[PDB]
Amino acid sequence: QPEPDMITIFIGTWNMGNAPPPKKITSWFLSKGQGKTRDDSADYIPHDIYVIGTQEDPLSEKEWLEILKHSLQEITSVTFKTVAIHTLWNIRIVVLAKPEHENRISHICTDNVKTGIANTLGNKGAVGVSFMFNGTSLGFVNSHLTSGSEKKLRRNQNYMNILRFLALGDKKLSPFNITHRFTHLFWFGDLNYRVDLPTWEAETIIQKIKQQQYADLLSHDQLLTERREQKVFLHFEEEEITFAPTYRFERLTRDKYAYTKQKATGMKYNLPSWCDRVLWKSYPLVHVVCQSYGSTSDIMTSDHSPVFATFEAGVTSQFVSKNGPGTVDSQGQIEFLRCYATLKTKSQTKFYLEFHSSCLESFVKSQEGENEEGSEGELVVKFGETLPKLKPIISDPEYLLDQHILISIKSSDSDESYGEGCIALRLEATETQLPIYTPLTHHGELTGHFQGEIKLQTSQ
Ligand SMILES: N[C@@H]1CCCN(C(=O)CCC(F)(F)F)C1
Ligand SMILES: N[C@@H]1CCCN(C(=O)CCC(F)(F)F)C1
Numbered sequence: 001q002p003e004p005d006m007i008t009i010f011i012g013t014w015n016m017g018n019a020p021p022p023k024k025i026t027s028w029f030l031s032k033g034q035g036k037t038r039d040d041s042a043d044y045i046p047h048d049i050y051v052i053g054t055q056e057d058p059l060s061e062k063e064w065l066e067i068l069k070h071s072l073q074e075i076t077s078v079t080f081k082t083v084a085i086h087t088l089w090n091i092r093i094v095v096l097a098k099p100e101h102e103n104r105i106s107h108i109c110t111d112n113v114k115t116g117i118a119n120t121l122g123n124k125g126a127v128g129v130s131f132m133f134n135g136t137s138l139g140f141v142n143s144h145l146t147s148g149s150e151k152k153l154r155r156n157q158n159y160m161n162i163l164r165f166l167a168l169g170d171k172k173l174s175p176f177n178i179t180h181r182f183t184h185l186f187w188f189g190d191l192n193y194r195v196d197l198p199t200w201e202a203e204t205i206i207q208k209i210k211q212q213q214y215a216d217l218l219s220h221d222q223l224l225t226e227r228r229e230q231k232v233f234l235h236f237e238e239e240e241i242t243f244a245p246t247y248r249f250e251r252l253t254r255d256k257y258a259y260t261k262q263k264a265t266g267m268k269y270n271l272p273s274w275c276d277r278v279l280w281k282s283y284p285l286v287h288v289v290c291q292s293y294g295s296t297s298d299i300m301t302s303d304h305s306p307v308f309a310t311f312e313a314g315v316t317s318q319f320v321s322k323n324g325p326g327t328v329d330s331q332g333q334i335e336f337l338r339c340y341a342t343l344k345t346k347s348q349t350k351f352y353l354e355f356h357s358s359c360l361e362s363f364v365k366s367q368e369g370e371n372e373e374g375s376e377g378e379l380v381v382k383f384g385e386t387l388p389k390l391k392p393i394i395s396d397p398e399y400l401l402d403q404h405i406l407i408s409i410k411s412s413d414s415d416e417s418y419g420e421g422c423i424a425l426r427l428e429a430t431e432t433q434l435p436i437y438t439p440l441t442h443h444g445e446l447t448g449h450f451q452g453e454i455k456l457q458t459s460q
Contacts, residue, residue, distance in 0.1 A: 003104075003134055003317040006287065007048035011278045011309045013142065015055040015190040017302035018090070019251070021067060026075055027296045028306045035243030035294025038310065046076040047310065048101060049083075051129070052094040053142030055190040056302075061085050061092070068094060084129040088112035091189075093127045093142040107132045113165045115158040120146070124158060126189070130168035130182065135316035135358075135402075139168050139182035143189040148268055152222045155192055156232040163444045172363070173356055175408035175417040179235070179444050183404075184282045184313050187236065190304065193223035194273040195245065202259045205272050209244050209257070217245070221274055234444055236279040239293035239309065245272035246295050246305040254300055278309035283404045284438075285426035287314030316402050324393025328361065331459040332395030334405065334425070336387040337433055339452030341369065341409045341440065343379040343418055350412040351381045359392040359403040359425075368412055381409065383452070397458035401426050407450055409440060419447040423454065430456050 012028055029050065031038035052068060059067070065082060072080050081102050083095035091112075097105060107130070114125040126143035143162055146154040169181030178185060195217050197205060208217055218224060218241060226232045248270040250256040261267045276295070282288040292310040299306050323329040341351065353366040366388055369381035392400055403425045408417040419440025427434055433453045440448040 004048075004315055006312055007133065007315055008291070009186070009311045009313055010047040010050040011053075011140075011186050011188050011311070012051070012306060013053045013055075013188040013190065013276050013278060014306040015144070015247070015276060015302060015304040016057050017251070017304060018056045018058045019301045020058060022299060022301050025067070025299055025306070026071055027298050028308055029071060029075055031292035031294060031308045031310055033243070033294055033296040033298070033305075035241070036239060036290070036292050037294050038292045044076060046072070046078045046098055048098055049133070049138070050080065050096040051140045051186065052096075053188050054092045055090065055142075055144040057087075057090050057092045061087060064092065064094065068096065072096065083131060084108050084110055086110035086112065086127045086129060088114065088125055088127050089123050091125060091127050091142060091144045093129055093140060095129050095131075095140065101133070104134050105131050107170075109168045111167045113162045115146070115161050120154075126162040126166060128166050128168050128178070133315055134318045136184070136314070137169060137182045139178055139185045141166065141178065141185070141187040141189070143187065143191065145190065145192045147192050149194040149196065149271065152193060152226060156226060159232050160443055173406065175354060175410065176356070176406055176420050177444065179281060179441065180406055180420050180422060183286055184280065184288060186278065186280045186311075187233070188278040188309070190275050191223060191277045192275050193221060193226070193277075194275070195271055196220045196222055196225070197271060199269045199271065202269070202271055206257055209272060212244070214241065214244070217272075223274070223277060230446065233279055234441065234446060235439065236281045238277065238279045239290040241274055241293070243295040245274050246307055247273050247275040248303045249300070249305065251303060252300050254297055254305065258303065276304055276307040278307060280311070282313070283422055284424040287312065319394055319396070319399040321394045321396060323395070328391040328393060329395035329459070331457070332392040332400055333457045334390035334392065335455040336383065337385055337453040337455065339383040339387055339450065341381040341419065341448055341450045342374065343381065343409065343440070343448040345379055345418055345447070347411070349414070351409050351418065352412060353383065353387065354408045354410060355388075355390055356406040356408070357403055359394065359400060360390060361393060364388050364390055395459035397430065397460045400456065400458050407438065409448070409450070418442055419450070421450050425456055427454065427456055430458050430460070
């Protein structure tokens with residue numbers, strides 16, 4: 001029985017509006033409705049992993065697990081295994097996998113983050129799950145961010161708190177937040193970004209939706225505009241949106257958007273918006289392809305419609321050689337030439353690098369770099385040819401070219417990371433000097449760049 005080099009992953013997000021679901025929700029798991037939808041010829045083909053995020057979920061974990069498992073069994077005739085379930089207040093994540101994957105999955109972690117303070121602490125935040133699937137790390141975040149059209153900055157703050165404080169994946173990756181810990185990271189939920197147009201344009205917006213003309217609405221979507229200005233979700237992807245706004249509907253139909261201010265809304269308008277979203281970030285040069293992104297048309301218990309997204313995702317096997325794991329393979333090495341970090345910091349400490357990778361027995365600390373002043377004000381930290389030679393556990397190019405090196409640049413004075421990034425070893429050539437590059441971030445904001453050259457030696 002061969003190990004897979006690809007899997008498919010279903011991501012669902014649904015704000016259930018504190019109402020039980022209807023008796024049939026299979027269209028959600030089949031990616032049928034509006035947008036980029038899944039071919040009918042695939043309906044019986046189970047996804048490898050289903051990740052379900054709910055918000056305003058009124059059900060117990062038991063109640064929802066029974067609905068989800070029975071739904072997937074009806075679709076696929078497969079009885080899925082429960083990988084993980086985690087609930088904060090009414091925010092929930094469920095991970096289900098095909099039974100054949102049970103002994104491919106390990107290191108399962110769950111966590112939550114509560115956003116806000118006092119007033120604004122009590123119902124928003126995020127839940128997440130991570131695990132290893134053979135050689136590949138997978139992370140999943142379901143967030144319910146702050147509501148309201150005039151709170152985009154609060155949503156951006158909620159995002160930064162979640163990526164700082166959600167404790168998933170390998171704790172040995174201490175300088176790295178969740179935006180660097182996984183081969184593939186999926187972040188979804190009721191992110192609550194709105195279409196920023198004047199209230200008076202409500203009926204115009206509805207018109208446009210009825211005509212399936214989304215371009216003039218998407219150009220005012222706060223998540224797309226905030227992402228363009230690098231205010232949030234830096235270095236994440238989202239498929240093009242080709243489905244109608246998923247909020248705010250009258251319940252029990254999809255024929256009506258309920259946008260007008262009511263006591264029940266705190267006298268706020270809810271112009272039609274794409275509140276419910278799926279984004280991802282994968283390590284450089286790993287296969288990931290969105291195969292569906294859309295909303296259901298036939299699930300109408302909530303004022304939100306469910307959103308689905310599906311992905312092909314590259315995975316690797318749990319590699320064993322005669323040497324590593326348990327030793328190094330002297331036929332492998334990773335060298336760095338002419339490397340330098342460019343940092344936005346105004347500080348003057350010395351810096352050193354840490355290299356982290358599951359291709360190393362443990363992380364590697366460099367010597368301090370040499371600080372110079374850039375011609376436009378910047379700090380340039382030069383490592384020259386001084387960086388340590390990295391000794392991978394396995395030299396086989398079928399393993400090594402699939403790996404990645406995480407880099408942290410740390411202050412000698414405080415040992416605090418000023419920037420984190422990632423380099424792929426999926427090179428065009430071995431035993432050849434090749435350019436490398438990563439942006440550096442800290443708390444998910446841009447702090448600098450790392451560039452230089454790499455020389456990778458494999459057993460071939
Ligand atoms: N093909 C690259 C993928 C990642 C960043 N890129 C964007 O165009 C981001 C646009 C926005 F505004 F949606 F963020 C380019
Ligand atoms: N532990 C690995 C499993 C698969 C391939 N391997 C061998 O064939 C080892 C041969 C010898 F001579 F070391 F025993 C190494």
